[PDB]
Nucleic acid binder design. Structure first.
Lengths: 79, 72, 77, 73, 90, 70
RNA sequence: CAUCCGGGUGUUGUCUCCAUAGAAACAGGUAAAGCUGUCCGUUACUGUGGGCUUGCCAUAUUUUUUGGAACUUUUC
């Protein structure tokens, strides 16, 4: 469907995300998946208290991925 | 490759003691040897004991609440 | 062989349904989906204060239907 | 069924989430898991505001949907 | 298929066994509010239709205060159902 | 989604585990699974006191896994 | 460089045969037309009949729809 392939067409660019844990990371995408799995490099993690951190490689969970952010130029991509 | 199903078969025939963690309750612990199991992470622990180091004394566990299975 | 089939016959009915979050929504039913996705028309939703929304739409605890409906005649296939 | 979700396609709605946020923005897509993608997103924690852009929220995080405005031409 | 054989032999067979005789069932729900009513029809997920519903629940504001509520019909989804008691009259 | 992810470049490599409950442990990833369960050798948790163990980690409670050395 | 024998597409007109009531009625104008306004034929909410552009085609036991929820308390 359009919600799964819309992320795979965003790969290479940077996207932001939301967790069920509550913290968000940001980084340019390396891979996606049908589960809503993730893979980035150079994450910029930020908890609700606001502690900034660095994480090199991160794989993510489909259920734990809450709400993701896609590139604004990818809104003219056809479905 | 050492798969998570291929490791658990050695824990039954070896009869090793294994500690069980919680789904969302790290304050509790688990222990015991597992004789057999099932596909969904079902466990029949033998010599069942509940883990401030108050060890309280077959048990049957649900795979949805299992967290970790570490030999030793 | 499910109770979801009779709930599609519950269309046009008023229902003050409770949710797993625990809100209150009184409104007329539009349609019932096979995964319980229900559409509401001319609704009165409450959390906060009561706030009216026109087209309201797995968290539903139970819909408390009115007593004017005869249940056994709909409970047949 | 799925007749109700397509008729809202190309429409701005208010969708409440399970955490309590209600993101608002026009509907671009819908999926079988309740996955919807939106454009021009604005979250309202409550007196506040937030500017994101294009978001695709999951079916687990959703609570309901309610349309704010009619279809834009 | 195989759900029909367990429908009479299983623990849901008493849901037919009490529900066939018109017995009442006290169901302990997930909201911290036990349910008392008379059952009509149920399913494999335990989505039950009650008649003459009566809930019992404490409160605070703080001291303990119990309250009751009368419901005509309530098709409650089985996901909140956490313990169902087939308490017979006889 | 039977296709398991590609941790094969990190297999037999040092790890910095992220788990549920604010838990972390270091160990060499020996094997992977379809569900993301891992097998760690030289188990050493991150308290500040680090106790060596020598470990089969569960998949779902883990959040991610990092690298000590690049 | 010409001539000659032939050709295509479009438009309006005309002729032939068949059909007909229909509102093919009225008025503006161009190089062309319902080009434009009024206008009417079925007629926009139903029931019977046809066709599909359709619902994706049916998963309570790990990444979305059968719940890890419930409940308590402080700080502003």
């Amino acid at each position: 469907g359009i919600p799964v392939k819309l992320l795979n067409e965003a790969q290479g660019h940077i996207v932001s995300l939301e967790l069920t844990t509550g913290a968000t990371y940001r980084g340019k995408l390396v891979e996606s998946e049908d589960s809503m799995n993730v893979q980035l490099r150079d994450v910029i993690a930020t908890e609700p208290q606001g502690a900034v951190t660095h994480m090199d490689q991160i794989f993510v969970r489909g259920s734990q991925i809450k709400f993701i952010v896609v590139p604004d130029l990818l809104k003219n991509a056809p479905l | 490759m050492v798969p998570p199903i291929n490791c658990i078969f050695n824990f039954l025939q070896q009869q090793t003691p294994v500690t069980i963690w919680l789904f969302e309750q790290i304050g509790i612990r688990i222990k015991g040897k597992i004789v057999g199991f099932d596909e969904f992470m079902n466990v029949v622990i033998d010599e069942a004991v509940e883990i401030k180091e108050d060890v309280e004394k077959k048990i049957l566990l649900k795979g949805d609440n299992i967290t970790l299975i570490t030999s030793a | 062989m499910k109770l979801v089939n009779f709930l599609k016959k519950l269309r046009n009915e008023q229902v003050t349904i409770e949710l797993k979050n625990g809100t209150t929504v009184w409104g007329t039913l539009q349609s019932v989906s096979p995964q319980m996705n229900a559409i509401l028309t001319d609704v009165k939703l409450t959390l906060q204060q009561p706030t009216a929304s026109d087209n309201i739409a797995n968290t539903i605890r139970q819909i408390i239907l009115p007593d004017s409906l005869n249940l056994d005649s709909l409970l047949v296939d | 069924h799925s007749s109700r979700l397509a008729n809202l396609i190309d429409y701005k709605l208010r969708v409440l989430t399970q955490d309590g946020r209600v993101y608002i923005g026009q509907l671009m897509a819908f999926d079988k898991h309740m996955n919807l993608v939106l454009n021009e997103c604005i979250e309202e924690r409550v007196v506040e505001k937030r500017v994101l852009g294009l978001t695709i929220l999951r079916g687990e995080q959703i609570l309901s949907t309610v349309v704010e405005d009619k279809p834009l031409l | 298929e195989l759900e029909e054989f367990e429908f009479k032999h299983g623990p849901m067979s008493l849901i037919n066994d009490a529900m066939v005789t018109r017995t009442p069932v006290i169901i302990s729900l997930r909201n911290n509010h036990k349910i008392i009513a008379r059952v009509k029809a149920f399913d494999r997920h335990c989505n039950m239709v009650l008649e003459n519903v009566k809930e019992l629940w404490t409160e605070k504001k703080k001291n303990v205060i119990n309250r009751e509520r009368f419901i005509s019909k309530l098709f409650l989804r089985g996901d909140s159902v956490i313990v169902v008691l087939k308490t017979p009259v006889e | 989604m039977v296709s398991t992810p590609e941790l094969k470049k990190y297999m037999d490599k040092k790890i910095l585990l992220n788990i549920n409950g604010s838990r972390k442990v270091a160990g060499i990833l020996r094997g992977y699974d379809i569900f993301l369960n891992v097998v760690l050798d030289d188990a050493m948790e991150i308290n500040a006191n680090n106790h060596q163990l020598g470990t089969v980690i569960r998949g779902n409670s883990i959040i991610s896994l990092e690298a000590l050395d690049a």
